[PDB]
């Protein structure tokens, strides 16, 4: 399930739109990547499936907090 474990970002639907303006159903789906992060608070490597932006969010809020969610939301990690 292409879904960013930190932002909830899943694929969305939309059209294509040719020059002639012809709609064709499609998907935008997120830039996922699943990345090994170091915790230090846990002396372990937790490897989340994250979209960039998901990343930019840890880079700011900070891992120990992001993982604080998930835990508090039920997610495995």
């Amino acid at each position: 399930s292409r879904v960013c474990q930190v932002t909830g970002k899943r694929p969305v639907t939309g059209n294509n739109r040719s020059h002639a303006l012809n709609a064709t159903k499609r998907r935008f789906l997120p830039n996922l990547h699943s990345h090994r992060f170091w915790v230090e608070s846990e002396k372990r490597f937790v490897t989340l499936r994250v979209s960039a932006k998901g990343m930019r969010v840890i880079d700011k809020k900070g891992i120990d907090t992001v993982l604080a969610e998930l835990r508090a939301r039920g997610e495995k990690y």
């Binding site: 230090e40 990343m55 840890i58 880079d59 700011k60 900070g62």
Partner: protein, 149 residues
């Protein structure tokens, strides 16, 4: 990605400076390998409280013994001396514990030779004020009274 530093660190490092580096370098090498930290603002005082509770705190806590020579600004009583010789001139030298013999009962008792003037130590009159090692900065002042016996 700005972040602040811990250890040194090649082309930017300085045990606590204010750098701005590509996020990769950080979330892949600096932190998760202890060398830097997200400048979470919370932090830019947590590590600026240091730059003040230090670089102007303990850099002031140095100054509490001004010149150390506080109330010793009127010479010190001359119990004995430091020696003389050459029937008129001078001949004898300071054994590795012999400029205290004089100021031998003042401040506190030691016995070490932090030599400051690398000369033959000039042989003439007697009473001389150079300095001596009293610390990594300040100085002191005292005199030398010879012994007539």
């Amino acid at each position: 990605m700005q972040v602040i530093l811990l250890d040194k660190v090649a082309n930017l490092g300085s045990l606590g400076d204010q750098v701005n580096v590509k996020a990769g370098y950080a979330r892949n090498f600096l932190v998760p390998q202890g060398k830097a930290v997200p400048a979470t603002k919370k932090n830019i005082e947590f590590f600026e409280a240091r730059r003040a509770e230090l670089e102007a705190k303990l850099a002031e806590v140095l100054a509490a013994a001004n010149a150390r020579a506080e109330k010793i600004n009127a010479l010190e009583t001359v119990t004995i001396a430091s020696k003389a010789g050459d029937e008129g001139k001078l001949f004898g030298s300071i054994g590795t514990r012999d400029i205290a013999d004089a100021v031998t009962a003042a401040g506190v008792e030691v016995a070490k030779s932090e030599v400051r003037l690398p000369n033959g130590v000039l042989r003439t009159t007697g009473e001389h004020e150079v300095s001596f090692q009293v610390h990594s900065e300040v100085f002191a002042k005292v005199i030398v009274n010879v012994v007539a016996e």
